[PDB]
């Protein structure tokens, strides 16, 4: 019933598998259709009702309930050598990496709005028991009309727990120093680090650290003009000691995070 209920369109991307544009024939709902080969899945779990699935599906199902800044799983399918996921697809949309590539460093007011919606989405995941572990500009989509951000690739994710993680499959340049040095981290505080990398990316147009030695050394240089407030939040998230990082709450009460724009106003001003 998969080949019948969706009409396939162009390839959107690959790297996590291959994702195509698609339409639900049922009712013209735009969708993204994502194929993952069994052979390349390292990491499996089980749905409450109990079959053996890719962790990504466990995670997506735990966070796709209700609204939020996560692209929702609408349906999934097993095939003999692959799994296939059907996801929301906002229309039109651009990923943040390509947005930043095209437009360079974001004005603060726009970064503040975007970063805020990222925090709301990640709180939402942490709440649903899910840790993303690969937060970064290419895992974030922009619905250009509504100004709403949406998180996407759960393939390196995990169940959130309070004990140490000794595996990491995400992106190195976004990984915290404790992972580089000890091969251990905790979820929240690792995620905060990656948030601080992301915020630097948004306001400087590029990631701050490229090599292991710079991650570990953790000194941040600004190549672009950034308010003292923005710089201080960033250095805070990128503190070397995990316990010196802010919690989500403290990131959202920081002075740089005041007077955020709603998504709609953000798009009027900045995206049309
Ligand atoms: O993974 C999605 C995606 C998804 O996983 C679930 C729903 C979606 O709507 C998408 C998605 O729209 C998507 C991409 N969309 C076109 C936006 O172009 C990038 C901006 O220049 C462009 C790329 C993309 N995925 C991978 C990003 O990098 C791939 C490099 O070729 C996606």
Q: Which domains does the chain have, with CATH numbers?
A: 1-91 (3.30.200.20), 92-272 (1.10.510.10)
Distance 158 CA to ligand 1 centre (A): 22
Q: Are 22 and 6 in contact (CB under 8 A)?
A: yes
The backbone torsions φ and ψ at residue 10, rounded to the nearest 5 degrees and listed phi first, read: -70, 155
Show Cβ contacts of residue 190 under 8 Å, excluding neighbours closer than 6 positions: 133, 165, 175, 176, 178, 179, 242
**Is 87 near ligand 1, meaning CB less than 6 Å away?**
yes
Nearest to 76 by CA among 124, 121, 41, 125: 41
Which tokens go with 69?
A: 């800044």
Distance in angstroms between the alpha carbons of the first and the last residue of the chain: 39
Nearest CA to ligand 1 atom 24: 13
Give DSSP secondary structure letters for the chain. -HHHHEEEEEEEEE---EEEEEEETTTTEEEEEEEEEGGG---EEE-TT--EEEHHHHHHHHH-SSSSSBPPEEEEEE-SSEEEEEEE--SSEEEHHHHHHHH-SPPHHHHHHHHHHHHHHHHHHHHTTEE-S--SGGGEEEETTTTEEEE---TT-EE--SS-B----S-GGGS-HHHHHHS-B-HHHHHHHHHHHHHHHHHHSS-S--SHHHHHH-----SS---HHHHHHHHHHT-SSGGGS--HHHHHTSGGGTTPPPHHHHHHHHT-
Q: Please give the torsion angle defined by the CA atoms of residues 152, 153, 156 and 157, in that order, rounded to the nearest 10 degrees.
A: 30
Compute the distance between CA of residue 113 and CA of residue 259 in angstroms, rounded to an integer.
9
Compute the distance between CA of residue 157 and CA of residue 169 in angstroms, rounded to an integer.
8
- Omega before 92 within 30 of 0, i.e. cis: yes
Distance 21 CA to ligand 1 centre (A): 9
Distance 95 CA to ligand 1 centre (A): 6
Task: Looking at the CA of residue 153, tell me the nearest atom of ligand 1.
Answer: 5
Which tokens go with 73?
A: 């799983």
This entry's atomic model was obtained through: X-ray
Which tokens go with 173?
A: 């340049």
- Catalytic residue list: 134
Show Cβ contacts of residue 215 under 8 Å, excluding neighbours closer than 6 positions: 173, 175, 176, 177, 180, 209
Q: Which residues are annotated as a binding site?
A: 12-19, 34, 88, 95
Residue appearing with tokens 């316990």: 243
Counted residue by residue, the chain has a size of 272
Q: Are 37 and 81 in contact (CB under 8 A)?
A: yes
Compute the distance between CA of residue 258 and CA of residue 198 in angstroms, rounded to an integer.
18
Nearest CA to ligand 1 atom 31: 13
Report the residue among 12, 93, 97 best suited for mutation to probe ligand 1: largest number of ligand atoms under 8 A from its CB.
Answer: 12
Compute the distance between CA of residue 118 and CA of residue 99 in angstroms, rounded to an integer.
15
Q: How many CB atoms within 10 Å of residue 179? A: 20
Q: How many CA atoms lie within 13 A of 30 on its CB side?
A: 9
Q: How many CA atoms lie within 13 A of 23 on its CB side?
A: 6
Q: Are 215 and 174 in contact (CB under 8 A)?
A: no
Q: Give Cα separations from 123 to 58, 102, 109, 127, 128 (angstroms).
A: 18, 29, 21, 6, 9
- Positive/negative CA dihedral, 268, 120, 231, 198: negative
Angle between helices 228-237 and 187-204 (to 10 degrees): 150
Compute the distance between CA of residue 272 and CA of residue 270 in angstroms, rounded to an integer.
6
Task: Looking at the CA of residue 89, tell me the nearest atom of ligand 1.
Answer: 9
**Is 98 near ligand 1, meaning CB less than 6 Å away?**
yes
Compute the distance between CA of residue 135 and CA of residue 151 in angstroms, rounded to an integer.
8
Compute the distance between CA of residue 97 and CA of residue 87 in angstroms, rounded to an integer.
20
Q: How far is CA 65 from the centre of its chain?
A: 17
Q: Are 72 and 128 in contact (CB under 8 A)?
A: no
Which resolution, in Å, applies to this structure?
2.3
Residue appearing with tokens 């003999």: 80
Which tokens go with 159?
A: 């169940």
């Amino acid at each position: 019933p998969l080949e019948s209920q969706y009409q396939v369109g162009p390839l959107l991307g690959s790297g996590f598998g291959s994702v195509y544009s698609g339409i639900r024939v049922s009712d013209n709902l735009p969708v993204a259709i994502k194929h993952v080969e069994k052979d390349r899945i390292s990491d499996w779990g089980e749905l409450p009702n109990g079959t053996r699935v890719p962790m990504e599906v466990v995670l997506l199902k735990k966070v796709s309930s209700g609204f939020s800044g996560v692209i929702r799983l609408l349906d999934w399918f097993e095939r003999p050598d692959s799994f296939v996921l059907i996801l929301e697809r906002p229309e039109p949309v651009q990923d943040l990496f390509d947005f930043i590539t095209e437009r360079g460093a974001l004005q603060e007011e726009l970064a503040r709005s975007f970063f805020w919606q990222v925090l709301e989405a990640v709180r939402h995941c942490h709440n649903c028991g899910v840790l993303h572990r690969d937060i970064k500009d290419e895992n974030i989509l922009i619905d250009l009309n509504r100004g709403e951000l949406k998180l996407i690739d759960f393939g390196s994710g995990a169940l959130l727990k309070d004990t140490v993680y000794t595996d990491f499959d995400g992106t190195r340049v976004y990984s915290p120093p404790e992972w580089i040095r000890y091969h251990r981290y905790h979820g929240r505080s690792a995620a905060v680090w990656s948030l601080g990398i992301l915020l630097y990316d948004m306001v400087c147009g590029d990631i701050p650290f490229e090599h292991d030695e710079e991650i570990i050394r953790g000194q941040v240089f600004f190549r672009q003009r950034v308010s003292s407030e923005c710089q201080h939040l960033i250095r805070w998230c990128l503190a070397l000691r995990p316990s010196d990082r802010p919690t989500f709450e403290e990131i959202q009460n920081h002075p740089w995070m005041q007077d955020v724009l709603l998504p709609q106003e953000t798009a009027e001003i900045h995206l049309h």
